[PDB]
């Protein structure tokens, strides 16, 4: 369910030139704002980073 | 500049519309305020010392 929701949209006409890293090298391409209540039961059952 | 998969067969020819589409910026307020009492007007200026 998430993985299509992860890419139902399409990438914008945008290169930021200032990227948010992943401590290795990896650039971040999404945000996924959620509520506090949903984020709890989502993380502990659908692993993790 | 959208791609073209320019076709075989006698179906007529593809045509690149490299159109300029515009958008429109909104305007927002974002207002904030704070009180100041009847005293501290002579104070913070230098009157009532």
């Amino acid at each position: 369910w998430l993985v299509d929701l992860t890419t139902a949209t399409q990438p914008s006409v945008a290169v930021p030139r200032l990227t948010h890293a992943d401590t290795r090298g990896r650039p971040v391409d999404g945000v996924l704002v959620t509520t506090a209540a949903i984020k709890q039961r989502l993380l502990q059952s659908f692993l993790k980073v | 500049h959208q791609p073209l998969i320019a076709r075989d067969g006698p179906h007529p020819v593809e045509q690149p519309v490299h159109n300029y589409m515009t958008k429109v910026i909104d305007r927002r307020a974002l207002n904030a305020a704070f009180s100041l009492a009847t005293e501290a007007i002579a104070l913070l200026t230098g009157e009532a010392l």
Binding site: - | V24, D26, R27, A29, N31
Partner: protein
């Protein structure tokens, strides 16, 4: 003063922009006094109260309810109005657009309905976002109280037919109330509910008092002093009306509150109280139609 901003919505045309250039100095009504407002609180489409378009009653309920604002400077993306109802008395001079009478050096002008004048005059419509700004008419207190009681009197002769009420001279001018060709047939259907209000509050009370006062005085300082200042007035009205009309206490006193409840409605409805004053400086003391006037805050 405390200038309040009304937000211009998205894409309008240049005549819609020029429609915003023919309104610099009008009168605007708004529900709340938030420092940033939108155009959705302004339009005549924001006056719906029962799912239908309001009448001149339904406007004058809101015209006595919500708050006047006068646009000093027009803007792209904003509307600056320094509102009247905020500020101390006789401060914050503002500027209005006159309509056909004078607005003399005094008079304390009053906002009121458009269809007492030309209905599709000052009903300025935005074409792009498709809304309607029906600006009220600023009439001074004597003539504003004059014309409001004439058309409802003209509504009576238009109600159940068989002089001509419409001449009404001003100090100099002859004021043509009748805009005949298409307006007056729309007049008696847009003051339609309102005439019933001026009637039913008269038919109830007079037919209540003529079974109140005969039921009073014998059911004593108010007794003999009832007709003391009403000698040959109320007994004469008891002689005239009770003869050519018809003639129960527990529904009666129940009807006593209900009529007088409707009476307290109409006093807030009618009589058009002054809100802003013309008392200018160094003017010609006499304003003309389409010309500005320095207008000061409180009556």
């Amino acid at each position: 003063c405390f200038e309040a901003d009304i937000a211009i919505p998205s894409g309008i045309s240049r005549p819609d922009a020029a429609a915003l250039q023919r309104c610099e100095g009008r009168v605007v009504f708004l529900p709340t006094i938030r420092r940033q407002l939108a155009l959705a609180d302004v339009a005549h489409e924001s006056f719906v109260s029962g799912g239908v378009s309001p009448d001149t009653l339904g406007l004058l309920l809101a015209y006595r309810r919500r708050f006047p604002a006068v646009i000093t400077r027009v803007l792209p993306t904003r509307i600056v109005a320094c509102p009247v109802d905020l500020g101390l008395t006789h401060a914050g001079t503002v500027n209005l657009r006159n309509t056909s009478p004078v607005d003399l050096c005094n008079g304390d002008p009053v906002s009121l309905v458009p269809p007492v004048f030309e209905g599709q005059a000052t009903d300025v419509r935005l074409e792009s976002l498709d809304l309607t700004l029906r600006f009220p008419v600023p009439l001074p207190t004597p003539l504003a109280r004059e014309i409001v009681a004439r058309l409802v009197a003209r509504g009576i002769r238009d109600l159940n037919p068989d002089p001509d009420l419409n001449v009404l001279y001003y100090n100099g001018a002859r004021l043509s109330l009748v805009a005949d060709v298409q307006q007056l047939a729309s007049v008696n259907t847009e003051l339609r509910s309102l005439v019933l209000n001026m009637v039913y509050s008269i038919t109830e009370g007079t037919t209540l008092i003529l079974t109140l006062i005969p039921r009073l005085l014998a059911l004593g300082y108010v007794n003999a002093l009832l007709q003391m200042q009403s000698v040959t007035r109320e007994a004469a009205q008891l002689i005239h009306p009770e003869a050519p009309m018809l003639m129960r206490r527990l529904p009666l006193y129940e009807a006593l509150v209900a009529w007088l409840a409707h009476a307290g409605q109409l006093g807030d409805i009618l009589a058009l109280a002054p809100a802003v004053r013309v008392c200018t400086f160094d003017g010609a003391a006499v304003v003309q139609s389409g010309d500005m006037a320095p207008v000061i805050r409180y009556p």
